[PDB]
Amino acid sequence: KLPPGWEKAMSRSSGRVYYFNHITNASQWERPSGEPARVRCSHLLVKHSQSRRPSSWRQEKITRTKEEALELINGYIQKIKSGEEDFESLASQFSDCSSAKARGDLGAFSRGQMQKPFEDASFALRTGEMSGPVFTDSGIHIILRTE
Ligand SMILES: Cc1cc(CO)n(C)n1
């Protein structure tokens, strides 16, 4: 029926069907469009107190809860999707990763290199697409596939 990992869902508030991807946690009203050795992605990481290393260039001690970190991720996604803010701008300002200084760019990578949930979402994204919240041991990611 649908590309890898997509399924139909029903909006609780509107009754209109939509499409959810259980690998990338993307969700959209439009039916999804249309694997490479390498992909190139950027990401915006929000760390939390249970992160593998609860520190970052933004905060020596990251003390926010996973649920608080998810709410921050949800809000950033909202501003990206509404166009109030660009992914690159938010990543530079708020990503708890060292890649913030490169607007979240991680470069290209193969399978076997990243944390698995991150890897799977990256390779399930189509070029240009952005994930929903992706959970790894580092924290919570918004992933943007650029190549
Ligand atoms: C991790 C990581 C990767 C890169 C380069 O894009 N930075 C700055 N930090």
From Swiss-Prot:
Swiss-Prot/TrEMBL catalytic activity: [protein]-peptidylproline (omega=180) = [protein]-peptidylproline (omega=0)
Keywords: Acetylation, Cell cycle, Cytoplasm, Isomerase, Nucleus, Phosphoprotein, Rotamase
GO biological process assignments: cellular response to hypoxia; negative regulation of amyloid-beta formation; negative regulation of cell motility; negative regulation of ERK1 and ERK2 cascade; negative regulation of protein binding; negative regulation of protein catabolic process; negative regulation of SMAD protein signal transduction; negative regulation of transforming growth factor beta receptor signaling pathway
Domain WW as annotated: residue spans: 1-34
Effect of residue 55 to D/E: Loss of peptidyl-prolyl cis/trans isomerase activity, nuclear localization and cellular function
EC number: 5.2.1.8
GO MF terms, alphabetically ordered: beta-catenin binding; cis-trans isomerase activity; cytoskeletal motor activity; GTPase activating protein binding; mitogen-activated protein kinase kinase binding; peptidyl-prolyl cis-trans isomerase activity; phosphoprotein binding; phosphoserine residue binding
Tissues expressing the protein: Expressed in immune cells in the lung (at protein level). The phosphorylated form at Ser-55 is expressed in normal breast tissue cells but not in breast cancer cells.
SS bond partners: none
InterPro entries: PPIase_dom_sf (IPR046357), PPIase_Pin1 (IPR051370), PPIase_PpiC (IPR000297), PPIase_PpiC_CS (IPR023058), WW_dom (IPR001202), WW_dom_sf (IPR036020)
PTM summary: Phosphorylation at Ser-55 by DAPK1 results in inhibition of its catalytic activity, nuclear localization, and its ability to induce centrosome amplification, chromosome instability and cell transformation. Ser-55 is dephosphorylated upon IL33-stimulation of dendritic cells.
CDD domains reported for this sequence: WW
Domain PpiC residue range list: 36-147
Modified residues (Phosphoserine): 55, 92
Claim: Nucleus is one of the keywords in the record: yes
GO cellular component, one term: ciliary basal body
Top-level EC class: isomerase
Substitution effect: residue 97 to A: Loss of peptidyl-prolyl cis/trans isomerase activity; decrease in DNA repair of double-strand breaks by homologous recombination slightly less efficient than that observed with wild-type protein. No effect on RBBP8/CtIP
Any Pfam family matching the protein: WW
Top-level taxon in the UniProt lineage: Eukaryota
Location, primary (coarse class): nucleus
This protein's domain notes: The WW domain is required for the interaction with STIL and KIF20B.
Described function: Peptidyl-prolyl cis/trans isomerase (PPIase) that binds to and isomerizes specific phosphorylated Ser/Thr-Pro (pSer/Thr-Pro) motifs. By inducing conformational changes in a subset of phosphorylated proteins, acts as a molecular switch in multiple cellular processes. Displays a preference for acidic residues located N-terminally to the proline bond to be isomerized. Regulates mitosis presumably by interacting with NIMA and attenuating its mitosis-promoting activity. Down-regulates kinase activity of BTK.
UniProt-recorded name of the protein: Peptidyl-prolyl cis-trans isomerase NIMA-interacting 1
Gene name of this polypeptide: PIN1
